[PDB]
Amino acid sequence: SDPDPLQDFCVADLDGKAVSVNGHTCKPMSEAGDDFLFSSKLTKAGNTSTPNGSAVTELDVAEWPGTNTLGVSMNRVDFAPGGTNPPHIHPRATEIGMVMKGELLVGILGSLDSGNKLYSRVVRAGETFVIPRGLMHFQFNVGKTEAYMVVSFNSQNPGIVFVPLTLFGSDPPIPTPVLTKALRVEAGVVELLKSKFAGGS
Amino acid sequence: SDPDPLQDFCVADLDGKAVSVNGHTCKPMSEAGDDFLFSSKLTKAGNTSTPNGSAVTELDVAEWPGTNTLGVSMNRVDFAPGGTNPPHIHPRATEIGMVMKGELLVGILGSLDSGNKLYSRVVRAGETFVIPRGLMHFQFNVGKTEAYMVVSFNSQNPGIVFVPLTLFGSDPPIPTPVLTKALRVEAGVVELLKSKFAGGS
Amino acid sequence: SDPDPLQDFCVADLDGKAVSVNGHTCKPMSEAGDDFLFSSKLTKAGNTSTPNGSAVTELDVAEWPGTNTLGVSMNRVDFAPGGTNPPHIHPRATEIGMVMKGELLVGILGSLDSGNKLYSRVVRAGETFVIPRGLMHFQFNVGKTEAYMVVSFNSQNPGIVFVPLTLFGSDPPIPTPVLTKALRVEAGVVELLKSKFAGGS
Amino acid sequence: SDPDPLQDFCVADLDGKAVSVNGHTCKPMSEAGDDFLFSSKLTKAGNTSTPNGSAVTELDVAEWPGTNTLGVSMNRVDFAPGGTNPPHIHPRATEIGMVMKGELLVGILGSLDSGNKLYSRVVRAGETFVIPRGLMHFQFNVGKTEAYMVVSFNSQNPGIVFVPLTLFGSDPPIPTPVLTKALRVEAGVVELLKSKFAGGS
Amino acid sequence: SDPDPLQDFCVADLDGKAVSVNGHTCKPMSEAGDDFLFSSKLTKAGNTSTPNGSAVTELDVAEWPGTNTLGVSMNRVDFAPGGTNPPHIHPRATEIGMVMKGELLVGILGSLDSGNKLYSRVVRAGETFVIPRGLMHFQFNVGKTEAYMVVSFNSQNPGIVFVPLTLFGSDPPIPTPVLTKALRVEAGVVELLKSKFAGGS
Amino acid sequence: SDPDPLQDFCVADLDGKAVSVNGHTCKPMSEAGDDFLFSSKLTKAGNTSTPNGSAVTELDVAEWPGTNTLGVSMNRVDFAPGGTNPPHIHPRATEIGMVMKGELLVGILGSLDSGNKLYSRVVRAGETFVIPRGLMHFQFNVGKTEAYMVVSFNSQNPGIVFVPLTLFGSDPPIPTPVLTKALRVEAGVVELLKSKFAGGS
Ligand SMILES: *[C@@H]1O[C@H](CO)[C@@H](O)[C@H](O)[C@H]1NC(C)=O
Ligand SMILES: *[C@@H]1O[C@H](CO)[C@@H](O)[C@H](O)[C@H]1NC(C)=O
Ligand SMILES: *[C@@H]1O[C@H](CO)[C@@H](O)[C@H](O)[C@H]1NC(C)=O
Ligand SMILES: *[C@@H]1O[C@H](CO)[C@@H](O)[C@H](O)[C@H]1NC(C)=O
Ligand SMILES: *[C@@H]1O[C@H](CO)[C@@H](O)[C@H](O)[C@H]1NC(C)=O
Ligand SMILES: *[C@@H]1O[C@H](CO)[C@@H](O)[C@H](O)[C@H]1NC(C)=O
Ligand SMILES: [Mn+2]
Ligand SMILES: [Mn+2]
Ligand SMILES: [Mn+2]
Ligand SMILES: [Mn+2]
Ligand SMILES: [Mn+2]
Ligand SMILES: [Mn+2]
């Protein structure tokens, strides 16, 4: 997991000209102010009018620099009815979350050794779920109303590997011959899938 | 922080006769069932009719054995008007939280090297705070209504060191001459404070 | 990464009745024998007559119990001409590898913050590649001959999340409405893809 | 615990104008000299004429920059007769110590899960004690003569949270209404306690 | 470094029949007693009438089971005049030490990247030294009186690799042709050196 | 082990004027290029005409800057007939390797607690070995032809402590009186050994 802190506070210096290190260099304490341990960025619902039908409002170290070195971060996800936060992976964190409003099918997938078992249930207000580091998982709004959840991670920068978008719309895309062999379907089907992710989102 | 996991899942075997190790031994996967990644324990408010005027509903590994090895846990805290979750420390985790309802003064205290500086603000619905591992902190309900928050930790078992309860109601209590020297007051004041925590809570 | 060792040696006790812990309990040293630090399991090529056109011969802790607690493991992958080791993720390890024979296209994909960039090149005998923990990656045999590679991980049990198999052949499968929303195609296309992975491999 | 080192030596560059990171940037080896692995700062007794009746002579990374990245530090504590090193916490390290001269009552307090149990004994010359990371603990000189101890930590910068001083004399102090609720006594008692710590030490 | 603890206390169960794990299984708290955080084993000087002319009194987890999971241990080393604690390595810990009596030459050796540089000085009462994890180091009594030091490690079980004993008195010994090639001397010189360590100490 | 990464990529900035930190500062991604995850430095055999009769071709972070933060590295070792990679230690990594050509005696030595036990066998093409962090080990070419192996480490910078060279040819060398006491032979023998390593290699 994230390296442990070596002092009380180390607010990320996010200036583009700052020297680059594992994580982020820190602001001198004299420039950190009094409010760095606090945020209000998650008070408002994200706009769910996206191809997925969900919106992620991130509160990683880039959005909450006071989390730098502390080994944690958060985000909020809002869902239109029938919207999905599609199969995805966090390369560097386990996730722990609570549904705040609505009804969300939450699915978590074991690795090959676990027989690729799918664990899932419809999670409602006040109910929680946990997703081990690096495993594929998703959420899907099964209700008629807008739903949302708030989640936390044991990393300042968990990362997100969106499976459909990286499989079909990476920069540049994976060669079609690789995907026809891997997906066991003809080039026409692979190209149809590529066509849906051509815009980079 | 918590040791990283060495497999996908390892549900804590909480049987009193189980061999003891750092953390917990695990249930065989055949006996884990399908629901271990999920909990509903935080759906209901805790009873705030306590001396503190708050109630902690824990979702550590003891209450959510599916978190075993995963490096995370949660809890919920409810507050009566004027209620406090008193100055306390988590010995083994950073805390990251969101106020869900009401108005909570949240205070976070730096160590000696940070000049014992107090960082505080009134945190309202949807707003968040972060508490570095091992630092003293508190919450206080400054509103007229009941308030609650939901918090996460980067440990399955963060621990709680309540400052007033530990100082005055440890088992056995700290000798009075130690406390008179440390607190710079007469024995009468120390014995008064001890009398308020004589039940171990 | 994997927890550090707390003694010189701790050979995994792989008996089905052994108590379960994070990782594995260990054989008493009296029963470990003299050969546990050594293996010959990767001397022979795997059978590439598979749908993928590749074969993985694993040398994780299950196959090499002497690696228990040591923070490392290996495997070998053999490829038929035109064969793929399909897009996949290791949830708990960085991978570092060398191509031993043939010509392999090796592709490594950044996360969302890296713009889902695809880094790739054709890697030949004696040439090497490195794959950060949790990132999607693949290999494809672009040569006319059989190819093979030998790779190492900074975990005793890196895990493997095969993207096509997990998306379409999980147990149970991900519901079709989740996949139609995520993949931006009709149910017919999703059910076609499911049919190709219906045997769980 | 502290992040592991990534090279042999990395002497802290403690210049006030140096870029800030988790821990400290390092001096080039050409500027480190030949003596960085050694210190003589603990050869002399600290002056015990302080309100606590003890003096801490620190040998953390700020005083011994050669410890940077190495995951260890030390200090010496001297005690007047009847003097205390008051209830305190190290947020980022376990402590391991030896009494060198005199008779010191050493007390270590479990967390809530341990029933806030107090473990204690009078520790004499050559005898040792260990204090788990983040737990409240104290020392008290029960002898008629000056006493001292030398302790080590598994961090370059363990930190110190002095319980009485941060509870009553933080910058700014915790609001009195918070403390009356938490300590279960009247405002007059809280103000008396505050008055003893008003100077910041 | 050592895995972090997942609870307050976990006293090593050192029974020969206990299940084996990374580190040690733990005594139930009901059986731990009240004294596990304390030791008196280092109060007395070791017998320096040895070939080395020094004696190590160990306080690792085997001798102080209360250190289990806590990431620390200690030992004491006593020296006859002209005695050595010979060139050695700790495979799993940084060492931090203080000379308590006498005059000890302490030498610390950089790795190949550090040009195998030897850092050394004569360390006297109250003076300290630090040895990075895995590096070769030694002590030698240059005084006319008996000397002793007390050292701490950031591991419960640092391990000791004695260079002369391992090179010449391993069980079984390293083959003579390996040592003649490595040491650049004839078989006669190697067999002479082997003869000095033929008892395994 | 090496601190975990806090982002996808962080290519080492190896400019001599760069600020120094634990590990290495990183190049901005705009300057990293497209090829940093790949190397061809191990395609060619090293020249085995050295006193040891072996050559190490390193692929640590200094030679493969793309490994920075990723917790892995590699090297290749080539052996003349009768050549040795002499008893040595990696202070910061376990090693996992495969013999590619020839016949190599591979020896691994336990610490004092393991009775300084020597584990060894002749390892041939495709066969593997594992060496726990910090333990002394060697390889010796028992065949009539040139042999080679390729190994990986769970560190970007494992380090190398060559036992004969640091014992006898450090900068400056260990004083002869220390070595006569430690090795249990006369000064003449110690000086003969020193004479073989006087050139610093
Ligand atoms: C999202 O924002 C767009 C652009 O402002 C707007 O047209 C749309 O109605 C919004 N959707 C929702 C669900 O609020
Ligand atoms: C809350 O606790 C108080 C005091 O113990 C008790 O009188 C009351 O019955 C409790 N309320 C509920 C709803 O159980
Ligand atoms: C390889 O696998 C195929 C398909 O299962 C099988 O027909 C063939 O016998 C296998 N080859 C060997 C050498 O076992
Ligand atoms: C400590 O120092 C002060 C100021 O120099 C001095 O007056 C006092 O006597 C000293 N106390 C002791 C115990 O040495
Ligand atoms: C110290 O060891 C020597 C050699 O084994 C022995 O003769 C002597 O009795 C020992 N001294 C004590 C005090 O036990
Ligand atoms: C190694 O290189 C040297 C110098 O170029 C050469 O003389 C020697 O023959 C080479 N040895 C081998 C075994 O290639
Ligand atoms: Mn997620
Ligand atoms: Mn808290
Ligand atoms: Mn892979
Ligand atoms: Mn302390
Ligand atoms: Mn040592
Ligand atoms: Mn090696």
Side-chain angles (χ1 to χ4, degrees), chain F residues 64-196:
Chain F
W64 197 355
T67 59
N68 192 47
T69 78
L70 303 186
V72 291
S73 67
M74 290 177 75
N75 71 217
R76 175 186 172 139
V77 189
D78 292 91
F79 301 78
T84 192
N85 194 19
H88 69 276
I89 287 149
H90 307 290
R92 298 176 298 272
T94 127
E95 176 180 342
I96 192 164
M98 177 181 281
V99 169
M100 294 314 308
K101 182 181 182 282
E103 300 169 279
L104 287 173
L105 174 65
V106 180
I108 304 131
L109 295 130
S111 68
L112 186 62
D113 266 21
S114 299
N116 296 310
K117 180 165 282 177
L118 172 63
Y119 296 96
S120 73
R121 75 179 297 272
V122 176
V123 183
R124 292 174 175 84
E127 301 183 317
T128 57
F129 56 86
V130 61
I131 323 274
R133 130 201 320 279
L135 297 184
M136 200 186 297
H137 61 288
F138 63 86
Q139 299 91 22
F140 182 84
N141 185 358
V142 301
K144 291 170 188 166
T145 65
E146 195 168 79
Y148 87 100
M149 68 186 194
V150 175
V151 309
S152 299
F153 304 92
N154 68 342
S155 177
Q156 72 181 46
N157 190 213
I160 187 148
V161 174
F162 278 121
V163 170
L165 177 61
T166 127
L167 242 203
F168 298 116
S170 59
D171 179 19
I174 298 166
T176 294
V178 176
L179 294 177
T180 57
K181 191 71 179 179
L183 302 167
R184 301 167 191 178
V185 292
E186 314 164 33
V189 180
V190 171
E191 297 294 351
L192 177 68
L193 287 151
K194 281 191 176 181
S195 79
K196 311 296 180 174

Side-chain angles (χ1 to χ4, degrees), chain B residues 53-176:
Chain B
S54 66
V56 180
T57 304
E58 295 195 66
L59 212 53
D60 56 355
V61 66
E63 292 293 319
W64 195 357
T67 61
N68 193 44
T69 78
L70 303 186
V72 292
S73 66
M74 290 174 76
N75 64 221
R76 172 181 176 143
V77 188
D78 292 273
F79 301 79
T84 190
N85 193 23
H88 68 275
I89 285 96
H90 307 290
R92 298 177 300 272
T94 297
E95 177 181 339
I96 193 160
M98 178 181 280
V99 171
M100 294 317 307
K101 184 177 179 282
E103 303 174 278
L104 289 166
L105 176 63
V106 178
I108 307 144
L109 297 129
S111 71
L112 184 64
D113 269 24
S114 295
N116 297 316
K117 185 167 292 187
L118 172 60
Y119 299 96
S120 72
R121 83 177 288 274
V122 175
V123 182
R124 295 175 175 91
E127 301 184 317
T128 59
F129 57 87
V130 64
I131 323 283
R133 130 202 318 277
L135 299 186
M136 198 185 296
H137 63 287
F138 65 89
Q139 300 90 20
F140 184 77
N141 188 355
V142 295
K144 292 183 180 179
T145 67
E146 183 148 290
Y148 88 98
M149 68 183 196
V150 174
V151 308
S152 299
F153 306 90
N154 68 344
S155 178
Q156 71 181 46
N157 192 211
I160 187 146
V161 172
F162 277 123
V163 169
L165 181 55
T166 304
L167 273 183
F168 303 115
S170 63
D171 177 35
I174 299 167
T176 295

Side-chain angles (χ1 to χ4, degrees), chain A residues 45-50 80 146:
Chain A
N47 187 302
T48 60
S49 294
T50 66
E146 195 168 79

